[PDB]
Design a protein around this ligand. Structure first.
Ligand SMILES: CCCCCCCCCCCCCCCCCC(=O)OC[C@H](COP(=O)([O-])OC[C@H](O)COP(=O)([O-])OC[C@H](COC(=O)CCCCCCCCCCCCCCCCC)OC(=O)CCCCCCCCCCCCCCCCC)OC(=O)CCCCCCCCCCCCCCCCC
Lengths: 63, 57
């Protein structure tokens, strides 16, 4: 292979791997922030569905 | 002149005309927390695949 081919192929390889490395560091930072704060789509541990609540007038009024 | 109610009448659900206002917050609930954001957008492929150490897909 030519030095041109090896050179520019090395540049493409280095671009792809540097971009994957930056995305891995961002993935770690996103995971840390979403576990700490809990406002992302991840770490959403379930709560009680409020569709289960009965809203009818009950037997006694004070409720 | 009073008539005794028939079997079934004193258990009817009746409508009441009131002048007092309807209670707007009878449970005295405070402001609800704002929800988490929904997901939006089109689903693009993963940038350079799985990014698991060397797996290029
Ligand atoms: C018009 C419509 C149709 C169009 C058709 C166009 C295509 C025409 C050809 C069709 C056939 C295509 C076949 C698959 C394509 C080639 C894939 C390939 O070589 O990937 C290179 C891959 C990465 O190299 P690359 O230079 O970055 O990519 C070159 C290509 O661009 C690779 O491209 P890529 O970037 O897309 O690769 C994706 C990714 C690239 O890989 C990665 O991202 C890296 C991770 C790879 C796995 C690492 C695992 C490490 C731990 C396990 C170690 C295993 C040791 C080896 C086996 C031991 C004995 C079983 O691969 C994977 O994730 C797949 C996992 C590996 C399987 C590879 C395919 C095997 C198919 C045949 C299996 C036969 C048995 C072979 C032995 C079994 C193990 C391979 O290298 C390896 O995985 C090393 C092993 C070699 C792979 C097998 C070679 C394929 C042909 C085998 C024929 C001889 C069989 C001998 C007898 C049986 C064994 C005793």
């Amino acid at each position: 292979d030519a030095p041109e081919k090896n050179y520019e192929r090395t540049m493409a390889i280095l671009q792809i791997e540097s971009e994957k490395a930056e995305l891995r560091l961002k993935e770690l930072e996103v995971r840390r922030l979403m576990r700490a704060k809990g406002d992302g789509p991840w770490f959403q541990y379930p709560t009680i569905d409020k569709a289960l609540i009965d809203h009818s007038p009950k037997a006694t009024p004070d409720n | 002149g009073w008539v005794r109610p028939d079997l079934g009448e004193l258990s009817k659900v009746t409508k009441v005309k009131t002048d007092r206002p309807l209670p707007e917050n009878p449970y005295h609930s405070r402001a609800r927390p704002e929800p988490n954001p929904e997901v939006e957008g089109d689903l693009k492929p993963a940038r350079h695949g799985s990014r698991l150490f060397f797996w290029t897909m």
